[PDB]
Amino acid sequence: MDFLKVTINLGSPMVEPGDLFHLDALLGALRVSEVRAELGDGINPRDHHYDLPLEQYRSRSGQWVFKASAFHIN
RNA sequence: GUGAGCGGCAUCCAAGUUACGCAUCAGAUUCGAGACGCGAGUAUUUCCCGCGCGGG
């Protein structure tokens, strides 16, 4: 519902990802961190990492992907 | 549930042995403790400096 550009600045060098580093993956990890903070460590991580503020793209075969590009490494 | 999560560059090792700051070189040439303190000139006022008195 709104096009955005997420920019992250590093204070320490990161591990260069071997494969794609997706924005939705990081957002899901942070959301799971929030759910852990509120509830605890007994939560199922798979029950909360889809509750992200990103809209989804669905193809013909029903395959859907979050609308968040993989992070650009410069 | 960030191709995530988890993971000691760590252990051991002599900078050491030997080596003359030494040989040579005038602090010399000239010159006095021996000289230097008044017995030096008349009588009573003259031009003047500060102002009766200090004073050329």
UniProtKB/TrEMBL annotation:
Superkingdom assignment: Bacteria
| Protein name stated in the entry | CRISPR type AFERR-associated protein Csf3
